[PDB]
From a paper:
AcrIIA15 is an anti-CRISPR (Acr) protein that inhibits Staphylococcus aureus Cas9 (SaCas9). The AcrIIA15 protein, consisting of 170 amino acids, is comprised of two domains: an N-terminal domain (NTD) from residues 1 to 56, which contains a HTH motif resembling a transcriptional repressor, and a C-terminal domain (CTD) from residues 57 to 170.
The bending of dsDNA upon binding to AcrIIA15 prompted us to investigate whether AcrIIA15 undergoes conformational changes upon binding promoter DNA. To address this question, we obtained the crystal structure of free AcrIIA15 at a resolution of 2.34 Å. However, due to the different relative positions of the CTD and NTD structural domains in the two monomers, the structures of the two monomers in the same dimer are different. Structural superposition of the AcrIIA15 structures in the free and DNA-bound states showed that they have similar structures, suggesting that DNA binding does not induce significant structural rearrangement in AcrIIA15. The crystal structure and biochemical assays in solution reveal that the full-length AcrIIA15 adopts a dimeric form, while its CTD alone remains as a monomer in solution. A hydrophobic core is composed of specific amino acids, namely L44, I5, L8, L9, L32, L39, L42, and L50, from both monomers.
Numbering used by the authors:
A (entry chain D), B (entry chain B): 0 to 170
Write the structure that this text describes.
Amino acid sequence: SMRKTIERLLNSELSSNSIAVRTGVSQAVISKLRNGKKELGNLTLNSAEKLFEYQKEMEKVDTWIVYRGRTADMNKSYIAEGSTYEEVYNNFVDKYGYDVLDEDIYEIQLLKKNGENLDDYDVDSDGINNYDKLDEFRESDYVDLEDYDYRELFENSSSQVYYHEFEITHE
Amino acid sequence: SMRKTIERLLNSELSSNSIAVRTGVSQAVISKLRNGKKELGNLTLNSAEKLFEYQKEMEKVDTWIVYRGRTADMNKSYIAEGSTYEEVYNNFVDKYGYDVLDEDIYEIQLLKKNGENLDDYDVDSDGINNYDKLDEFRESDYVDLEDYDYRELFENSSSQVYYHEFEITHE
């Protein structure tokens, strides 16, 4: 855990008790670090990591995502929000349901992520048609969708929502 | 220090006395770490740093980082490389420019690292809008970004590049 980051935490206006509660390091240690009775280099690696990780979180850039979707006819508009693409997807389905995005988009994304073949699953605009292979695939061990895959769930979709915009802010 | 690097040193074939003469760390401590008498967490920050800095210099020549960035266009992907995360960023900006990563991500990360409140800088999806206060901060005395911050500039970006992969030799 780098000393310069721990020093930024120790020279901060936070109370020694508040640092202790939030990090799990004793107030006694924090106080001795702040008054010079204990040198920072004398901290154990575990406690140094706890202080370093808390200060990194205090300096972490935040992310907020606003999704805007439009139908090809531009009659209907959709808006979903969240700090990750999964939360945006969850907000979208909570607001508009699970039948607005392309059919089986979640499963199709899983198949694409695992190296599977679209021809084998009879993928169609209506949806995956070969259900028996898909049920066997669920029994098969596979890698779960990552956060980026939830963004692709919107972008791979064209049946009802054709226009997809993701506005990101770090404020 | 970083555990992973120190764990490489202890596990890799070397003499505890040769480690002692090269690093200055007591042979008793190196032996106790290897035999499980001393846990790496209980090692003081001073000794952990001396062990880490040694292994780092012995791996500096062989250390390479490859970054891969995914976008909505499957055909369009970004590659950057370097011995440090900062070098990876410099290769990325030389090859692709400064308008691919999220707006003003470098400056926003710098502001956050220095404890600045983004409200004062009028941050939104367009980036920093209050250029006057940014000019004051640039002319102020501030802490520069450290190496891990450059990995974060890619990791926190989600507008154009939303999936980030780092391949590190760690040797």
